[PDB]
Ligand binder design. Structure first.
Ligand SMILES: CC[C@H](C)[C@H](N)C(=O)O
Length: 240
């Protein structure tokens, strides 16, 4: 009867959303991965040669400057070198920054959560890794990514007009979202009454007057972090 057909329709939809979540998660994994690779390659080059002349020429290579807003080296002694140039706030110390600390704590590649950029003052995410030469940490290489760029990547398609995608941490922190007002809120703040759980399937919740279906897919291949690709789908539209 109705209930079994209700379930048949629901499972069909969940199957479709699962597919979508999978290949969308892979897409963002692979996009982020190319950037992680540049940072890794850059740090490994610097481990062998970090003279001021090499640092300058390296950070100026177009494969970096056309990929990141800024690419930079923060050294163990606090010295900072960045391309391209920017006005910089007084007091700046790269060793105090989230990207530096996250990279050293991970002992290798990392992605920060959004943090307030020192110069542009906007939220950004950074790919970073320590520069290690024979066990000696010389400093950390970082490359900055705009949140705007990331929302574009995971929202390449509009899911038949059913909804959109966002990024969220395992602890429920919204990292990247089409709605700037939702960024760095938690799932619990956005959904105080009936909070979607990250494990391990599908949830309904109410947003802006409408029932949405939320589904979370792990993003693999992100070193040191546990992030999910979330689909947020208008429920009534989806079943139509
Ligand atoms: C100017 C920005 C620097 C390079 C980095 N994104 C930071 O805020 O620490």
């Amino acid at each position: 009867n109705d209930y079994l057909q209700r379930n048949a329709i629901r499972e069909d939809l969940e199957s479709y959303l699962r597919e979508m979540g999978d290949v969308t998660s892979s897409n963002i994994q692979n996009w982020l991965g190319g950037r992680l690779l540049l940072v890794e390659q850059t740090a490994q080059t610097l481990a062998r040669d970090h003279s001021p002349e090499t640092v300058s020429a390296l950070l100026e290579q177009p494969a970096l400057t056309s990929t990141f807003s800024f690419t930079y080296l923060g050294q163990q002694d606090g010295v900072f070198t960045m391309r391209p140039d920017s006005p910089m706030p007084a007091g700046y110390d790269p060793r105090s920054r989230p990207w530096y600390k996250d990279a050293v704590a991970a002992g290798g590649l990392t992605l920060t959560e959004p943090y307030v950029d020192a110069a542009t003052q906007e939220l950004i995410i950074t790919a970073a890794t320590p520069v290690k030469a024979a066990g000696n940490t010389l400093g950390v290489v970082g490359g900055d990514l705009s949140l705007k760029t990331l929302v574009q990547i995971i929202n390449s398609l509009d899911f038949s007009g059913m909804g959109y995608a966002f990024l969220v941490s395992g602890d429920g922190k919204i990292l990247v979202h089409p709605d700037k007002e939702q960024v760095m809120k938690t799932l619990s703040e956005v959904y105080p009454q009936n909070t979607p759980k990250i494990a391990t399937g599908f949830s309904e919740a109410e947003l802006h007057g409408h029932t949405r279906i939320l589904a979370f897919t792990p993003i693999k291949g992100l070193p040191s972090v546990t992030w999910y690709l979330a689909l947020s789908i208008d429920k009534d539209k989806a079943y139509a």
